[PDB]
């Protein structure tokens, strides 16, 4: 209506932010940025609702205005900066490094990593095409554009970005047997290996993925993120639970035994 919207009602916010109904009328509308609105996590939500370092928005604004928060190696002072999948957030003042990886329950896990692992990230290649002066380039899932890629790189591959120079360390070809995380649908957060890829020209390609518990599920190719060269060898540390989906009865048994 006459231009872009700038507000987000609390009830209309993404459910994986885990915002409460009665805390207010509105929710933080994520800014434009590397990640899509529905698949991101604003830094105000990450720093206040998840870590609970800040108790409210005045404190998250004071924190970010003191230059503490860095995302992917660059200082951000935008309280609504749209942090997203695979981004590295470093707070060296508290000496903490986090990686935003989905857990098998569909939410962004609070997954702490070492600074050495916080020195890089993975990006899924969305497209390869020619830029100006006939220079090929690759677009990753977080909107990055890397020039002069390896001529072997094609779409749906995953590259490992050095994240300090922005260059490509190495890559993983999309093929059968690669480790994959699902980045969409009801299988969000699950990790498994490709068993067989079923193609549908003019439609959506479907990927068959087998869980570590030999559970097989089907999902769209757009929801598939390659994270490792083979089973049990991910290129990033997985969150607690290792992406193995348990039935509700099994979860109930595990919680009962854990709590007594």
């Amino acid at each position: 209506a006459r231009g872009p919207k700038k507000h987000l009602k609390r009830l209309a916010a993404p459910s994986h932010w885990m915002l409460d109904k009665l805390s207010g009328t509105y929710a933080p509308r994520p800014s434009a940025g590397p990640h899509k609105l529905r698949e991101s996590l604003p830094l105000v939500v990450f720093l206040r609702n998840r870590l609970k370092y800040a108790l409210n928005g005045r404190e998250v604004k004071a924190i970010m205005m003191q230059q503490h928060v860095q995302v992917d190696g660059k200082v951000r002072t935008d309280t609504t900066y749209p942090a997203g999948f695979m981004d590295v957030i470093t707070l060296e003042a508290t000496n903490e490094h986090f990686r935003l990886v989905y857990d098998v329950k569909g939410k962004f896990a609070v997954h702490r990593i070492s600074a050495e692992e916080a020195a890089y990230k993975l990006g899924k290649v969305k497209k390869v095409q020619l830029g100006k002066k006939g220079v090929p380039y690759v677009v990753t899932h977080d909107g990055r554009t890397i020039r002069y890629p390896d001529p072997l790189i094609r779409a749906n591959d995953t590259v490992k970005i050095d994240l300090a120079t922005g260059k490509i360390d190495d890559f993983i070809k999309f093929d059968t047997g690669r480790l994959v995380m699902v980045t969409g649908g009801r299988n969000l957060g699950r990790v498994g290996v490709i068993v067989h890829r079923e193609k549908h020209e003019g439609g959506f390609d479907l990927v068959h993925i087998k869980d570590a518990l030999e559970n097989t599920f089907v999902t769209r190719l757009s929801n598939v993120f390659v994270i490792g060269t083979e089973a049990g060898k991910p290129w990033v540390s997985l969150p607690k639970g290792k992406g193995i989906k348990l039935s509700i009865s099994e979860e109930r048994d595990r919680r009962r035994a854990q709590q007594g």
Partner: protein
């Protein structure tokens, strides 16, 4: 009280749609246009006041008009404006030629002078050097990243040459 607008060749008042840049109007917001009644540019008997500028001084002094004078409120501020104002060369130092008006605050008086614009300073030259050095450094980083890619392509193509030879 309606003012006269240049170009309206009438002795009476008319209503015009005035916009930005027009006299007799001040737009409240950008792109705003107002229909206002304005007086024509032809003098008649219906004027309440007429504004006149003396072109050539007459015979007799006017009591409060031609004997005294009021100095201009501000002196030149831009460096080149100072240079035009009183014979400076591009090599002269404008810094010790600004006219300073001194204010008297009770007992102690100090002078206030404008900040000169378009003045070339070591910081300005440092910024010019930084911009051109950065442009050259960027150009070399791009042309050696391109050279490195040319090495990568040449390596791959030679490897595919031997791959075809094997196959």
């Amino acid at each position: 009280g309606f003012p006269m607008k240049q170009g309206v060749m009438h002795p009476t008042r008319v209503r015009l749609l005035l916009s930005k840049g027009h006299s007799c109007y001040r737009p409240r917001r950008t792109g705003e246009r107002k229909r206002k009644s304005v007086r024509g540019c032809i003098v008649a008997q219906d004027l309440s006041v007429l504004a006149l500028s003396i072109v050539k001084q007459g015979d007799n002094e006017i009591e409060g008009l031609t004997d005294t004078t009021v100095p201009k409120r501000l002196g030149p501020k831009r460096a080149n404006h100072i240079r035009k104002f009183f014979g400076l060369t591009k090599e002269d130092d404008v810094r010790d030629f600004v006219v300073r008006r001194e204010v008297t605050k009770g007992d102690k008086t100090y002078t206030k002078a404008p900040k000169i614009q378009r003045l070339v300073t070591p910081q300005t030259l440092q910024r010019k050097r930084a911009l051109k050095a950065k442009k050259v450094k960027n150009a070399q980083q791009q042309r050696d990243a391109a050279a490195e890619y040319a090495q990568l392509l040449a390596k791959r193509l030679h490897e595919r040459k031997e791959e075809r030879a094997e196959i």
